[PDB]
Each structure stands twice: as C-alpha cells, then as structure tokens.
C-alpha cells in the first residue's frame, strides 16, 4: 500500500479539530471523567489538538509548546483506572462516530489510542 501518515490518512488538521471538539463535549458529560478534568476544557483541548497532530505523524506541535509528551508521567497526577480508560475510549469512539470518521484509518488511529490509554492506566479498578 502507498505510504501516508495516519494524520493525512484520517484527513489531517480538519479531522483532528473536529474530533477534539466532539471529544471534549463527551468528556465534560462523562461522570467517570468530568470530575478529574478541569471545568474549563479550553486549554486541555488545545493541548490535545497539538498532541494528536504530532501523535499521528503531523507537525510536532505539542513538543514545540509543551516539551516532550511524557504522557504516562503527566498522567500519574491522576487516578487512571481501567474503568476511566474505558470511559475515555468510549468518549473517543462516540466523538469519532459523531464527526462521521469511519474506516480503517479511523480504526488504526483508535487502536493506537487503545494502546496509549492502556499505558496511561495507573491504578487498579474500584470493586465493591
């Protein structure tokens, strides 16, 4: 198959922008996520747009402004249980669906996010 970055494959900037906007609306509404995210998600969304751009092989926007992602380390500041990772991923799938992003490039991207989310998990789930 022809080589292209996943960033291009999914439609680049415009897709990332739409996706992030949709994603944070879902995060704001999610009871497993809402309390650990800032009430104002403006800055978060900005950073995620930059991060996902870089993560997908687009320009290194996130590093330029914030330094190396060191995402797992940054996430040690929060309790990320498997349930919370599932909530994040469920918001992401819902946002991808909402913006009408479907197909193999979507799933390849989603699978990268499943792996990253798994890497972020840092606390056992709360059971009974």
Residue ranges of the annotated binding site for heme b are: 44, 47, 62, 75
Question: Among residues 19 and 117, whose Cβ is nearest to ligand HEM?
Answer: 117
Of residues 38 through 57, those in contact with ligand HEM by CB under 6 A are: 38, 43-44, 47-48, 51, 55
108 touches 115 (CB < 8 A): no
Distance of CA 29 to the CA centre of its chain: 16
81 touches 123 (CB < 8 A): yes
* CA-closest candidate to residue 63, choices 114, 55, 77, 40: 55
Q: Which two tokens stand for residue 58?
A: 């687009």
Q: Would you give the binding string for ligand HEM spanning residues 67-106, x where CB under 6 A is met?
A: ----x--xx--x-x---xx--x------------------
Residues near ligand HEM, by CB under 6 A: 33, 36-38, 43-44, 47-48, 51, 55, 66, 71, 74-75, 78, 80, 84-85, 88, 113, 116-117, 120
């Amino acid at each position: 198959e022809q080589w292209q970055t996943l960033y291009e494959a999914i439609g680049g900037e415009e897709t990332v922008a739409k996706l992030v906007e949709a994603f944070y609306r879902r995060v704001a509404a999610h009871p497993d996520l809402r309390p650990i995210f800032p009430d104002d998600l403006t800055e978060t969304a900005h950073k995620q747009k930059q991060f996902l751009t870089q993560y997908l092989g687009g320009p290194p926007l996130y590093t330029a402004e914030h330094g190396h992602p060191m995402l797992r380390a940054r996430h040690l500041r929060f309790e990320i249980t498997p349930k919370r990772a599932e909530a994040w991923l469920a918001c992401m799938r819902a946002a991808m669906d909402e913006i009408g992003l479907s197909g193999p490039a979507r799933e390849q991207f989603y699978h990268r996010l499943v792996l990253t989310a798994h890497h972020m998990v840092n606390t056992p789930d709360h059971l009974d």
